[model samples]
Target: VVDLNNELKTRREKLANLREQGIAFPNDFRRDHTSDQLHAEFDGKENEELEALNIEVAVAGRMMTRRIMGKASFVTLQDVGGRIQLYVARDDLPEGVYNEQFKKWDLGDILGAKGKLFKTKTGELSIHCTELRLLTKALRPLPDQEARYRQRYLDLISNDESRNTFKVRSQILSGIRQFMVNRGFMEVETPMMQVIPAARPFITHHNALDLDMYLRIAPELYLKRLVVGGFERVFEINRNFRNEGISVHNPEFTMMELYMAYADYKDLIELTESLFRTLAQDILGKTEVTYGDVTLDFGKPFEKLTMREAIKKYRPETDMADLDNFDSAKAIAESIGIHVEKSWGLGRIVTEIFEEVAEAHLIQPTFITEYPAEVSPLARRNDVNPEITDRFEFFIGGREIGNGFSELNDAEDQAQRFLDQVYDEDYVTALEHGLPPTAGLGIGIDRMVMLFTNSHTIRDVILFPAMRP
Candidate 1:
C-alpha cells in the first residue's frame, strides 16, 4: 500500500512531464520480432557466429526489469511472447537520449527498440540495443495474489507459472478448434439470451418483448434446433450462464457443444478418445502429460463402466442388484448417507449414490457409459432396455469434463420429459418438426484447460473468473 500510493503520484507526475513534448502514447515505432522469435532463430548460435551475422532487429515489449550501471545499463523487456534481455550502453544510443528518456522510462512502460543481435559472455542470447523509444507509459508501478484473479495483468507480470498457464490455455483452444474443424465440425454461434432454462439460471427483463428472459444455461436446445434445421454436424464454442453461486466454478463457463449427424453415443465415446489423444500428442508432444503427481496417457482404452459399476468399484461393499429399482436404489443411496428427494427415481438415486461414492476416484480418464432414463431426460432410450439410456459422461483428473448422448427424437417422450424437467416451447416444436439421429457432445473447455495446464482451480484457467464484492 505504501509503495503503491507513493509510486502512483510519482508515475502520474512523470506522465504529466511526457505530453509537454509529444503524445504520451507513441505509435510511430514498428517491431519485427517478439522476444520468443529472437530466442528461437538465434539463441543457440556461438557468440562469434552471431557477430558474423550482425542482424538488425526491431522489437517492442513492456519493460519488466531495469539495471542502470553508469556508462552501460541492462534491462529485460517482456513482449507478448516472453522476456528478452537488452544491453543498453550510454554511447550506443543517439546523443542525450539515454538519460533524458531511456533512464527516465520506468518498468511496465511499453518500449520499442532497434538493435543488433548478439550473445553475452554468459552464453545468453540478448539484443545489443542501439535505438530506443517509449511507446506507452503504465501509470501504475510493478504490481500480485485475489490480486491475481481480480487483476490479471499484475499476476502475469509477477508469476511466470500463471502466465504460462494462460499461454497453454490459448494453445489448447487453438488445437481443439482446429481438431474439431478438421473433423468437419461446422462452427456456429447461438444467442445467449433465449426464452429457456438449463440447470439453475439467471432471469432478466426483455424490454421490447415485455416479458422476462432466461439467459442460456447451455447451447443444447438451440444447437438441437440447428440439428432440426439440417446443420447436421454443428458445433458452438459457447458461454453458458448458470447461477451456481457456491461451487468451485464460475457461474458463466465456456463449453464446446457439438452435434454430429447419424452418430450414436458410442460414436462420441470413440470421438472424444480421438480428441483427447490428438490434443495431448499435438500440444504436449507425447501421449502422456503431467498433472500434479499423476501422468495421463490417452493411448489405452478409457476405463468404461456402468454408473452402478463405478459406485461398486469405489464402494466395494455395496451390492449390485439393489441399484436396479427405485426403492432398492433409494435404500442403497440412503444407506450410504445420501438423502433422496421424493421425486428421485431409480436413476436419480443411483446417480446421487455414484456422486457421493465414486466420482473422485476417477483420477484417470474414465467413462461411466450407461445412464438411467430418469436422470438423462434428453437421451435416446436403449432399444433393449427402455429404463436405461445410451448416454455417457467422462472424467479426467478426477473431474467430469465431457458428456454426450444419442438425442431423444421421440416428440411425445420429449414433451413428457419437459413436464418432468424443462426448456423452451420453440425447442419442443423443433423436435416435433424433426431432428436427424444425432449424437451431441459437450466438453467443458475451462475444465479441460485446468487438466492440461495443471491448474489447481477453475479460476486459474479462466482469464477473468467472477469475483465477489
Candidate 2:
C-alpha cells in the first residue's frame, strides 16, 4: 500500500548502524538549561564577556536545522521554550566523531550538547559544543498541512506558531481558573455522561448499566443542581459533546459553565466584561489586540442591544408588529434568504433571522439580550414582558463566546418548559426543593482560545481535535 522514501530508508539504516555501535537512542543525557534559560542568562553578554564568564550549560532538543562547512558546523536545536544555535567544530569533539556521528544525523533527530556560552561573529548568542550525542533518530519526514492535523506531534515539532498557540491556550485556562477563584467561585466537576439533554447529545451504550447514556452537551443542569445543594458559587471547566457537524463547531469541545447564587443576568453582563478585560491583560498583557484583519479593543465597555432592537437595526424593512406573528415572521425570514419550517414558531423564526442578518456584523464585544421565552427554556421570564426571557449571548469577532441568563428557579415553570421539550424529572425534582435566585453562564473555551490566538478554526487551538477515520 505504501513505499518508503530514500530519506526514510537512509535514516532507518543509520538507526541500525547506531544500534550496532552500542550508542542508539540513549536516555542518560540530562539537560541543565532550557533555550529560554540560556538566553535570559547570556543574551546581553558580549563575546569577551561570555568567554570571561566561561558559563557551562547542557541543553537537549530536536536538531531542527544544520549547516556544515567541512570541519565546523552550526546547528539549531529547538526545545519547548524556543530555539538556540549550537556551533560544533571537528576539533572540539573526539577524533573523527564530527564527521562519523554528527554529520550523519538527520534534521529531526533528537540530540544533547554540553557547551560553554559564547557570542558569534554576528553577535548572536550560541553554544560552542564540548560534547555532543544523538538521543533519538527520526526515521520519517513530516507531512503537509492536512497531515499535520492528523499527526499533531509532527506539527508541534515543525511549527513554532502551533506550539505557542497551545501555550497560550494553557495560560488562558489558568487565567480563567484564577479569575473564578479570586471572585470566590468554587471550581467543580460534573458527569461527562449524563441522562439530561440540553442540546443534541452524543449517545453510547453502557454495558455495565445495561442502558444507553448521553455525553453532556452542557454542564448547566448539573452546575445549577450544585447551587441548590448550597454551593452558591460553582464552576466547571470540562469537555462537552454534541452530535454536531464540524466547522468552527467540534463534536467534543471544552466549556466553562458557572452559576452565581442571588444574582441576575445583569450582574453576569458586568462580570463577563471584567473577565474578558482581565484575561486579555493577564494572559496577553494588553486589553487591545488584533484578531485577523480586524482590531478589537477589549479595554472599553462592550455594546448591548435587545433582540428586537438588533433585528430592527439589521432588518429595518421588517415591521416590529410582525416579529411576534408566525406567518409574518416566516415571510420576513424567507424575504431575507432564510428557510423556515411550517411548524416553527415565531420565536424560532426570529432567532434564525437574527442569526442570518445581525450576528456577523457584531465584530466588537456585544451583549444581545431579551431572548424569546419559547426558545429560552432554562431562562427566567422577564417581569415586564412574559414573552421574552432575561438572557444574553456575548459575541466578539462575529462569533458567540459566552451565554448568560437569570436562571429559571420556579419548579412549576421549569417543569412546564421541560414538558414542552423533553421531560427531565430528576432536574425538576431538584428545582422543587428550592434553588436560590441565580445567574448562570457558559463560555466556549475553545472559541475563546481561537479569539486570543487569532486562530481561524477551532481545530487549530485544540491539541488533538477529533478526526474522521
Candidate 3:
C-alpha cells in the first residue's frame, strides 16, 4: 500500500507554483557530457590537478539524492550512463537562485546543471554548480516492488539494476542480428497475423473481410515459404502471439527464427553452440555465466543426448524396452505421477516422462535430440526409424532455449503429417511447390534473455509483459 495523499498534495502544490511562474516543463536545456564521460575524463585527477584544469560541463539528469547543509548542499544526479555528485553553495549561485529555486525542487525532478569539475577533500569527483534549473517535476511517488513492474518508467527511474538489465537485453538482440547478418543471412519480416495456425494462435475478427484471422504463433511456415522462393538464408526477430498461460510464458513474446537451405540438424547443433558462445563473448566477455544456483558454460561443447539415452540416464532403474511400447510407456508415465490420455501414443508418453524426470536435472547447457514425430509435426522424420524426427531442443538452466530440425522437403509426407494432425491446406499447397533440403531454428528470445540476464521470470526481461485485467 502507498500513502499518496500527502506526497501528491506537496508535489502538486510545487507544480502549481512553477506553473504560475510561466515555467511549463521546459526542455530547451542541452547537456555537454554524461556522468560516465565526466568520470572517464577526470576520475584519476587529484583535487589540485582538477582545480588547475578547470573543466566545465553541462549535464542533465534526475535528482536521486540531496543532503542539505544550511547554505550548501550535496546532490546526486543519475543519468542513463551513471551517477555524479553535485556540490551546491548559496554564494556560488546567482543571488537568491540557490535558496529560492534549487532547494525547492523535489527528489525525482529532472534538472540541468552547469558546473566546473573538482575533487572533494574526501577524494570523490564532484561538480561545483554555477547554474541549476528544474526541468520537470514528478507529481507522484514511485511504488514498491510488485507495483514497480506495472509502472516500468518509474522502475527504470529508480532502479539501476533494472535499467542495466534492459540495456543488456537490447545489446543481446543487436548481437544476434549481427551474428546472422555476418553469416550471409538476410534479415526478413513475416506477417504477425496468419491463416495457418502453428500453436494455439490468438484469433481476432477481420470485420472488413467478414472472417476471423489468427495472430501468428510461430513464423516457421512463412519463413520456410521464403526458402522455397530461393532465399537460401533468411531470419526474422519479431513478436509472436499465442493463446497461452502467463507464468514463464507471455501471451505475446519475441522469437528469432531462421532457415538455411542445404543445412542439416547436425549442422544447426554446431551452429547453436557457436551462436551461444558468440553472444556470451560479445556481451559478457566470458563463456561462463551464473544463473541462481547454476553456472552454464557456453564456450564448451554442449552435450548431445538421444531421447532414450536421456530417459535412461535420468531413470536408470527403468527398462529400456518400455519406451518402445505404448502400454509400457503409459505405465511408466503414470508411475511417475504423470497423467496420460488413452489416445496418446508411445512417443508422446515417453516425451512426457522424460520431461518429468530429466528436464530439471539438465541444469547446464545440453541438447536433447531425436524428438517424437507426433510431437514435431514440421520436422523431417528419421530415415532409419520413422517413429522419431531429426530434431533437438537446446536447454540451459532447466529451460528450453531453442528448437531446430531438418525440414521435411517431401511434399507428400508433409501433407500426410499435417492431415494426421490438423490440416493447414495453404501450407501444404506451398510445400507442393517444392521446398528444398533446409534446416530451421527457433529460439525463445525472452527465455534466452532470462538466462543471460539472470532474470528469474520471463516477465523481468520483457519491457511490457502481459498483465491480467
TM-score of each: 0.94, 0.94, 0.95
Clashing pairs in 2: none
What are the per-residue Cα lDDT tens digits for candidate 2 across 1-469? 1555788789889888888899686889999899999898788877888778788899999888899988999999998889889999999887888988898888888899998878788767788999998898888854446676888998888788899899999999999999999999999988888765655768888898888888888878888899999999999999988897776478889998899999999999999999999999988987888998998889889999988888889888888898768788888889888868777788889988889989998999999999887677677999998889999999999999999999999999898877777477888899999899999987999989889988889989888877776
Instruction: Note the Cα lDDT for every prediction shown.
Output: 0.84, 0.87, 0.86
Query: Residues 1-469, candidate 3, lDDT per residue (tens digit)?
Result: 4467888989999888888996659978999899999898888888877778788889899888999999999998989889999998899977988888888888888889998988787777788999888888978765435555787887888777789889999999999999989999999998988765745668898888988888988888889899999999999999888797887478988999899999898888888889998998889987899889878888778889987889899999899787788888788899889989877887789988889899888888899999887777767889999889999999998889988899988888888877776467777788899889999887999989988888888878888877766
**Highest TM-score scorer:** 3
Which pairs of residues clash in candidate 3, taking residues 3 or more apart in a chain or in different chains? Answer: none
Judge candidate 3 against the unseen true structure and give its global Cα lDDT, from 0 to 1: 0.86
Question: Tens-digit lDDT track for model 1 on 148-255?
Answer: 888887888788989899888889988888888998888999889877573577889988889888888777888888989988899888688887783546889888
Give me the runs in candidate 1 sitting further than 4 Å from their true place.
246-248, 325-330
The prediction achieving the highest lDDT against the true structure is 2
Q: Number of backbone collisions per candidate, in order?
A: 1, 0, 0
By the lDDT metric, which is better: model 2 or model 3? 2
